[PDB]
Amino acid sequence: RHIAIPAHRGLITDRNGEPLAVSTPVTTLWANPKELMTAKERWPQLAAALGQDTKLFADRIEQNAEREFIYLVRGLTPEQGEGVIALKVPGVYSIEEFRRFYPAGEVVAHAVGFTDVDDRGREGIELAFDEWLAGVPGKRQVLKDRRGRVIKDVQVTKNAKPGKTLALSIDLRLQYLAHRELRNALLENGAKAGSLVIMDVKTGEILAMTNQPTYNPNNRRNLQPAAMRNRAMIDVFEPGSTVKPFSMSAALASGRWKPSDIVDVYPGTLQIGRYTIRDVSRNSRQLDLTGILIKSSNVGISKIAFDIGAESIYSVMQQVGLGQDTGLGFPGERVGNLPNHRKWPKAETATLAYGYGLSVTAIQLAHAYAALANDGKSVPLSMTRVDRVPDGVQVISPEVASTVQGMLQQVVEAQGGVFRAQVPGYHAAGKSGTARKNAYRSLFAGFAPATDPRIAMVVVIDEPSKAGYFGGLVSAPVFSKVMAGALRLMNVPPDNLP
Numbered sequence: 001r002h003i004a005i006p007a008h009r010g011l012i013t014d015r016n017g018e019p020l021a022v023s024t025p026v027t028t029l030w031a032n033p034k035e036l037m038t039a040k041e042r043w044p045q046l047a048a049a050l051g052q053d054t055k056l057f058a059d060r061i062e063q064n065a066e067r068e069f070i071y072l073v074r075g076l077t078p079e080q081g082e083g084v085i086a087l088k089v090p091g092v093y094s095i096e097e098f099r100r101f102y103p104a105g106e107v108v109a110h111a112v113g114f115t116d117v118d119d120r121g122r123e124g125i126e127l128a129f130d131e132w133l134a135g136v137p138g139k140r141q142v143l144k145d146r147r148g149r150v151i152k153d154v155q156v157t158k159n160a161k162p163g164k165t166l167a168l169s170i171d172l173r174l175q176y177l178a179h180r181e182l183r184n185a186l187l188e189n190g191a192k193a194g195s196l197v198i199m200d201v202k203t204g205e206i207l208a209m210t211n212q213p214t215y216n217p218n219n220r221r222n223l224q225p226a227a228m229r230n231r232a233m234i235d236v237f238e239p240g241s242t243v244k245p246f247s248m249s250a251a252l253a254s255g256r257w258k259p260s261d262i263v264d265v266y267p268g269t270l271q272i273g274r275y276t277i278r279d280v281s282r283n284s285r286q287l288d289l290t291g292i293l294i295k296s297s298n299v300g301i302s303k304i305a306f307d308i309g310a311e312s313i314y315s316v317m318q319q320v321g322l323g324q325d326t327g328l329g330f331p332g333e334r335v336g337n338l339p340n341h342r343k344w345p346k347a348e349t350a351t352l353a354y355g356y357g358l359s360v361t362a363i364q365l366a367h368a369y370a371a372l373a374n375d376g377k378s379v380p381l382s383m384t385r386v387d388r389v390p391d392g393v394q395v396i397s398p399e400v401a402s403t404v405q406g407m408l409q410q411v412v413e414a415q416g417g418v419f420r421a422q423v424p425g426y427h428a429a430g431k432s433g434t435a436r437k438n439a440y441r442s443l444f445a446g447f448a449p450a451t452d453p454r455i456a457m458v459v460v461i462d463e464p465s466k467a468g469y470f471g472g473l474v475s476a477p478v479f480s481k482v483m484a485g486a487l488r489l490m491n492v493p494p495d496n497l498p
């Protein structure tokens, strides 16, 4: 009785108007088997025109002989569709439909996602913003005799309303740079999987989100399953040392600690009841707060955690969004877990403090660094272009955030620091770490320009079979290269000036 009139699906562009998902006209062929059944001699030419086996085609028509609508083929070009319609096969009609094509392809596959056969969002932005993008389908009334001769297509019951254009937060230029550099780093280190997230610290915008391995959304016939995984939003891990700047934020906000305060960590181990906290680097006695970060001392961070209490640490981590909902409403996005133990024994206090007491995603870690870089102000995450920036929330006092930024600038720039993360022409800040899932990931989280932050970035490189990945060796060089390129693409003035 009714045949739907598909609506033009809204265009998806990057933030600069570059096309990412385009509704393109296609011609679909359908048939009324009751009418096709009267023209059996035409079937082989029809089957041959559709590149279909004559018998498989005949069986399909015979098996559907009492039906009034079946699809023959979907998604042909207008010219191909016209050519078959030009054979004048009785009971064979055409529907002008729309099919999504993804011009940037594998470069932004997970972020954009894709639609199903019926042009409905199935993954990523296509799904998250399906109501905005879809539009309203039309309706046409088909009236036939008491069998299969089309008596009336009388009218169109309702016209189609097209979907709405959507500009993503993604900057395809930064996305391409991140994609290329993550693939390069994976090949260099013998790694197979990873993610790279770039964020605008002032606006909450996700400027880049790339996952390796990736896939071509235009050709989804039996791909590798690992390729489909949106790692940045789905791979949950214990962030480890990358959350020590948050434990430091709690220490500075407690009123008990100043950056020049000292902690004795010798001999790089600390016994707490039956348990032993151990530092990987064990060449220290007295360290200031910046030194605890540079040497990544678990003993140093744990002693501070015992002094200030785990409640203060848990609260900073919860306030910056670690193990919390992002509010993006992105399909398949995971939350992780930040356990609120209410009362923490010494062992749980220490493990929380050096980041093995919680599980987060790369997106949550990048959002947490954005808050720190944005002078302690958290702006809601956005996968769409943000024109009017929300007020956000002051989650870390501006004083504490500015102090920790300076400590992280020293982690990158000071003697003995993560020098492979330095960005020529700029001052940069960040912290390397080894994530845990035991499966490991090499991490670098940071932001730049260090003295007036604009961009936050997280690099996650998955550690294969055997260890040996140090975040400072593996992920830090990727941060340097992508950050150098992203700041220049954004015309951010160099801050490393005399």
Ligand SMILES: *C(=O)[C@@H]([C@@H]1NC(C(=O)O)=C(S[C@@H]2CN[C@H](C(=O)N(C)C)C2)[C@@H]1C)[C@@H](C)O
Pocket (backbone or CB within 6 Å): 239, 240, 241, 242, 279, 280, 281, 294, 295, 296, 298, 354, 432, 433, 434, 435, 470, 471, 472, 473
């Ligand atoms: C945190 O993730 C763990 C520590 N964090 C780091 C780090 O700084 O990435 C280290 S590695 C330690 C510090 N610098 C040395 C280094 O980078 N190499 C010699 C290459 C060794 C620890 C793994 C923490 C939870 O133990």
